[PDB]
A paper describes a structure:
TMEM16 scramblases dissipate the plasma membrane lipid asymmetry to activate multiple eukaryotic cellular pathways. Our results show afTMEM16 thins the membrane to enable scrambling and that an open hydrophilic pathway is not a structural requirement to allow rapid transbilayer movement of lipids. Scrambling by the TMEM16’s is modulated by two signals, binding of Ca2+ facilitates opening of the groove while the properties of the membrane determine whether the scramblase can thin the membrane enough to enable lipid flipping.
Scrambling by D511A/E514A afTMEM16 is modulated by membrane thickness like the WT protein in 0 Ca2+,  and in C14 membranes its activity is ~30% of that of the WT protein in C18 lipids and saturating Ca2+. As expected, despite the presence of 0.5 mM Ca2+, the protein adopts the same conformation as in the WT apo structure and there is no density in the Ca2+ binding site. In all reconstructions the permeation pathway is closed, with Cα r.m.s.d. ~1.1 Å to C18/0 Ca2+ and ~0.4 Å to C14/0 Ca2+, indicating that increased scrambling is again not accompanied by higher open probability of the groove. Together, our results suggest that scrambling of afTMEM16 in 0 Ca2+ occurs outside of a closed groove. In the three datasets for apo afTMEM16 (C18/0 Ca2+, C14/0 Ca2+ and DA/EA in 0.5 mM Ca2+) we could resolve 4–9 lipids per monomer, all localized near the dimer interface in positions closely resembling those seen in C18/Ca2+ structure, supporting the notion that these lipids interact strongly with the protein.
Author numbering:
A (entry chain A), B (entry chain B): 11 to 94, 102 to 258, 268 to 312, 317 to 398, 421 to 446, 489 to 593, 604 to 659, 702 to 724
The structure:
């Protein structure tokens, strides 16, 4: 093939070790790779690092690897076939040959955690025929079929497959608010009740539909349940019998998220109040569109402030010392959600429920505010970042240098572009009745950046190892929390700013709209549970027939003496009736 | 033994058939019982009914029955051992031999549904040594050990076992509000905030603790997952390939619950308004405790009005034509919960939020109201029914007539005494801060009636066939809904009736108390998920070791030629570092 049958390539760096110490850690790595059935070949890489090439050493060793991985998947509950395939399947079982805890599988490699500090990251090689002769059919397509998502599952794994399927379903479901809000901008305007009810209905229906499509796609890609949690770079304090860490010592570090979030909220509310003060000063001392210059500056500085808070949250999450990857991911997603909620929505919350209604009590406290100010805030905080972001755009030595060019690329992260599609959903759920062209501005940006994720995953960063998944992650609970908060927030905004405040009716239409949201969400979930998707119905039919075939295969004392057999019992019965 | 090795006894009635028609249905029953390995013996019963006696016909047929039932339990997901025991286990596999759908198991008997109209109910025989030499150790005990619940699991099955464990845990958890409300009656009085917060905390903790004890007990009794749904007496319209019934035709009958519930609510609010009118008339035309006579009469007529609405709800649920038993049970529990919510709490809701605050606008509309009226209503609707209920109390022809006396008894129902323990929890969650002696009045009645369920299940009605369960049913969701409604209702009552109404603060302390309830419930659930019960930790340890033992048991082309083996690769590595 194009790649020289290479499954993986393992980069071992020696720029931080001695001359005689690196020759022992290299021999230990080669002996651990040769203890399992992996054939190794060493070549020179960069000026301080050499990489080895890992292949299946034989057909018998590869068959034993696939059988051991299928045994682990059947024992953990992923497989239900009691075992006795593709490119992603072979790459997954070879990555499980390299990187497991050595009690099963083998080779014990953890890339830069402990006792393997010299080796750098390991990675497979890019399928050139799949990211050249198929990447330029996916960018100029605008919509992907299920057989097209099968090609992004068979390469790059089910993790990338679920991420791209979620982006496709979100772009397909975004076409309804992008048409409806534009239809409710030429006809109804800002703060309309019809658009708010239909927008909250859409926010319910999209989440309850993707929750069904996830169970559809995890039964289609034969990955219906993944609870096989993996280890990490945990620093265990004791070693009592397995490394242990007390949860009471973890909660005392988990409580540090509260002062961090509170200080970030105060430090951003100070910037928002400063922007209000400079806007009032410019409105006093002169001016049409130039009076909202610091709001535009802080709305453009949002994505570089959230990154700083993201690095602080990553350091705080690494301090909390999690054991499993499926807990570190959940805690990181919770911290990213808190940071993005503080960063992206609280500038609009502080001008929707604090600044504009209590204008006469804070404007004299700032000088040393009609609802169009809130409309301009929702305009400036969902558009200008995307405007600025789209303004910065304006014999075998060939294979070895291709691999050396592939080792200098970045590493892909789903959790960076999936964070933005949560901020968009939070702007859609919470403050979208303020300006109904928020879905149009999101759909245009998504249609522009649709051909930017294929390019990124194909030519900009290296190929990820094929990771299995049954869901997009804990972002699907963040979407539900955003819809729940938006059902209160949009109803309060529509009451406060359509057409005194009558404070009993505001807290009545908060209560009734929240509980109507809960009732309608239960109804939509129970209605979508009834209708079964096809590729999880085929799996249920197959698992029913596989059980029915097996079941059809497998198929004092003188009182019980007066009626031998059953014909005598029938004779006693016929004598006893008459 | 005492019983003549009798597993089951099947009563066949002939009081409604002809003389020659009953001799064929009897022969069909005996042939269907003899097709499976069951030895039958016929004797005369009552003047229009004769019963047969069903035993395991051989050891090989009994072993085949246990193996087929274990195969069905392993295929449906109950068993995880891949098969190659007690009294309840033998009675369960013999009942599964008699009553299944004949595609598996055999004998096809459905007791009075279709093509078996002549046979009456079937039932096992009472273990006299277990309900005589052990029932008079359980009534005068007041508390049951786990080895004592094992005796009510090994007889009467896991359904009765979970019901008695729920009653024991509820009686043990009721001792804390029965002490705390009595401590908050000598010190604080009615409508106190401390008792309301602690009562809502107790309502959270009891439900989130029984949800953990259910997963404890279902892993202890080897019944951790039961999703093996059974058929029923469904009348299928078409027969397209299995009898089918469209859900769109079922929803049009399910919508009849709304006019039934609305008409019951209006018909009870009319009686409550009539009782208010007669109370105001007696208060005008004369009288200390006699002025609340119709309230006492309607509070005593509550349990005989809820029974009439229960029969209407049972007819409506049988009209809705459910296919599975695990859906008929859920819909019946929902209808019973709606009926009991209308019957037991809406008389207190109509005098807490309608009559007492708007007294000056309805008292002139009734004549042709201090919060002590609400306190007297909560007194009269949680006590006087229990007062009236506890005021109405003030050679082988011996075995055959014992069986004939056992066939005239009633049939046990868990869902009749488990309904009252939901009405008690609803009175505890919703209106208990009005009068803090509600938990004392419930604990005294529960301690009185604790020795009345053992008597009922042992000597008053016949022995149920051992039914398996993993939960008490869909009552555990009704308890959570009652706690959710009570977190709003008790906070509104404490704001309205402690020490103008200031209608913004009422709908503020509704909102904050409901969302504080949700936050604290999530915290209590996440804290109780951390702490693992012992008998589900032993099962997890066993399922981990059973997998670890099996896993330890089971364990272009010229580029891959320059380094044979791995020692040559280490030589190339040591040459390439230096
Ligand atoms: C300052 C606040 C700090 C909160 C930190 C405590 C963490 C609380 C959230 C705990 C959590 O795991 O939330 C999951 C979803 O994430 C979430 O919706 C996050 C919601 C809580 C974050 C909201 C804080 C508003 C910040 C202004 C629930 O998912 P599940 O399936 O388990 O149910
Ligand atoms: C104090 C008063 C707080 C008001 C916040 C208003 C939030 C309005 C949306 C409320 C949404 C909410 O409460 O979520 C609950 C869990 O919460 C959580 O995991 C954590 C939410 C943290 C609340 C933010 C502080 C539901 O959990 P469940 O089991 O139903 O799924
Ligand atoms: C559902 C909620 C049902 C009833 C709400 C009753 C409150 C309405 C009382 C109206 C009393 C009134 O005179 O208010 C005026 C305007 O009202 C009005 O535009 C009425 C506006 C309130 C209607 C907002 C309902 C939220 C829509 C559903 C959310 C998603 C649900 C998810 C499904 C002044 O208004 P302003 O600005 O001068 O102060
Ligand atoms: C007049 C109203 C008629 C309601 C009939 C529609 C049925 C709605 C309830 C549907 C239902 O199944 O409720 C389950 C629990 O039961 C319930 O808490 C019942 C709550 C709804 C009944 C409240 C009506 C108040 C009557 C005054 C939810 O359990 P789950 O685990 O699926 O979540
Ligand atoms: C119209 C406004 C209604 C106000 C009723 C006030 C009820 C206050 C308690 C609200 C409790 C509630 O809403 O339960 C939801 C499901 O509801 C239901 O299944 C049915 C509830 C029916 C509501 C009674 C009518 C939660 O579902 P989930 O998924 O979180 O579990
Ligand atoms: C938690 C809620 C937090 C703050 C509530 C703020 C509202 C209080 C404002 C108090 C303003 C006021 O003057 O009200 C007076 C009495 O108030 C008061 O006794 C204050 C009473 C309100 C306190 C009720 C809180 C409910 C307790 C938690 C529920 C379970 C939570 C589950 C955890 C008159 O009263 P009345 O009768 O004359 O009309």
């Amino acid at each position: 093939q194009e790649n020289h049958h290479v499954d993986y390539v393992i980069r071992f760096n020696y720029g931080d070790i001695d001359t005689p110490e690196a020759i022992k850690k290299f021999e230990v790595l080669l002996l651990e790779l040769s203890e399992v059935g992996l054939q190794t070949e060493v070549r020179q890489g960069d000026e301080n690092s050499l990489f080895v090439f890992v292949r299946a050493a034989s057909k018998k060793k590869l068959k034993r690897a696939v059988y051991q991985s299928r045994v682990r998947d059947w024992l953990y509950g992923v497989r239900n076939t009691e075992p006795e395939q593709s490119e992603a399947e072979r790459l997954l079982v070879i990555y499980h040959l390299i990187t497991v805890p050595k009690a099963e599988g083998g080779a014990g490699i953890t890339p830069r955690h402990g006792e393997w500090k010299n080796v750098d990251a390991i990675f497979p090689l890019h399928d050139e025929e799949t990211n050249r002769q198929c990447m330029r059919e996916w960018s100029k397509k605008t919509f992907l079929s299920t057989e097209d998502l099968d090609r992004i599952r068979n390469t790059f794994g089910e993790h990338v497959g679920f991420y791209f399927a979620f982006l496709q379903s979100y772009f397909r479901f975004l076409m309804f608010p992008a048409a409806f809000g534009f239809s409710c901008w030429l006809l109804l305007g800002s703060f309309s009740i019809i658009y708010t009810v239909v927008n909250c209905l859409w926010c319910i229906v999209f989440i309850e539909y993707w929750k069904r499509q996830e169970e559809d796609l995890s039964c289609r890609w034969q990955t219906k349940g993944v609870s096989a949690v993996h280890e990490k770079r945990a620093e265990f304090k004791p070693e009592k019998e397995r490394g242990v860490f007390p949860a009471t010592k973890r909660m005392y570090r988990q409580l540090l998220q509260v002062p961090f979030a509170l200080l970030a909220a105060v430090a951003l509310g100070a910037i928002i109040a400063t922007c209000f003060a400079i806007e009032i000063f410019i409105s006093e001392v002169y001016k049409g569109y130039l009076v909202f210059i610091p709001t535009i500056l802080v709305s453009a500085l949002i994505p570089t402030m959230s990154a700083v808070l993201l690095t602080v949250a990553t350091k705080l999450n690494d301090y909390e010392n999690y054991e499993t990857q499926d807990a570190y991911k959940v805690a990181l997603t919770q911290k990213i959600f808190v940071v993005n909620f503080i960063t992206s929505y609280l500038p609009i919350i502080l001008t929707a429920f604090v600044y504009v209604p209590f204008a006469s009590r804070i404007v004299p406290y700032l000088d040393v505010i009609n609802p169009d100010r809130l409309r301009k805030q929702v305009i400036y905080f969902t558009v200008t970042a995307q405007i600025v972001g789209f303004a910065l755009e304006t014999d075998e030595a060939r294979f070895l240098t291709r691999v050396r060019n592939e080792a200098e690329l970045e590493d892909y992260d789903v959790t960076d572009a999936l964070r933005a599609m949560c901020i968009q959903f939070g702007y859609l759920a919470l403050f979208s009745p303020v300006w109904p062209l928020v879905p149009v501005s999101f759909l245009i940006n998504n249609w522009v950046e649709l051909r930017s994720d294929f390019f990124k995953i194909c030519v900009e960063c290296k190929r990820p190892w094929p990771q299995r998944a049954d869901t997009i992650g804990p972002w699907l609970d963040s979407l539900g929390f955003l819809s729940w908060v938006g059902s209160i927030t949009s109803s309060a905004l529509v009451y406060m700013f359509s057409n005194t405040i009558r404070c009993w009716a505001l807290l009545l239409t908060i209560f009734f709209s929240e509980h109507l949201y809960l009732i309608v969400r239960y109804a939509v979930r129970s209605a979508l549970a009834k209708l079964e998707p096809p590729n999880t119905r085929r799996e249920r039919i197959e698992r029913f027939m596989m059980r029915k075939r097996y079941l059809d295969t497998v198929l004092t004392e003188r009182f019980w003496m007066r009626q031998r057999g059953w014909k005598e019992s029938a004779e006693v019965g016929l004598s006893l009736i008459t």
